[PDB]
């Protein structure tokens, strides 16, 4: 009822910036990140 009240009260619910396929790509890149080896200094090498 507050979803169908946009057209009788005078407001609007705006869609989000990204669809659910973009935020499913954000958490799939978080699961398999390389993040080079954990005895090294720096953030510039990537050890698979």
């Amino acid at each position: 009822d507050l979803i169908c009240a946009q057209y009788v009260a005078g407001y609007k619910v705006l869609p989000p910036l990204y669809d659910p396929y973009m935020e499913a790509a954000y958490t799939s890149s978080l699961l398999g990140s390389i993040a080079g080896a954990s005895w090294t200094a720096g953030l510039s090498s990537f050890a698979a």
Binding site: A37, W39, T40, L43
Partner: protein, 117 residues
Amino acid sequence: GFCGTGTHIVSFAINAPNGLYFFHVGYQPTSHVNATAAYGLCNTENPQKCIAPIDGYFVLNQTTSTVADSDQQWYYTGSSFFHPEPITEANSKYVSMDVKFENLTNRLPPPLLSNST
């Protein structure tokens, strides 16, 4: 993520209207190389000694396509710039024995040799 993106080198601060304005100079690499690394090296004696790198990698100087297991010498490289150099005790720790470590017979680094004269 705190002081910009990448590896942080230095930052400067200047005055701005109603506050401060920061410049975060960081380190950005622009090319890469796929180097074959190792977890560590061990000799083949009893009791066994084993080493591991210090802030870097044990790599192979990939030049030709003929060097294999009698000329596969391992070098040390820093983790932020590829430049192979010899393995000494200035860049390697002693560690307890792992299974993923390479077993070496010849071409040992000086940490893995008989120090007794």
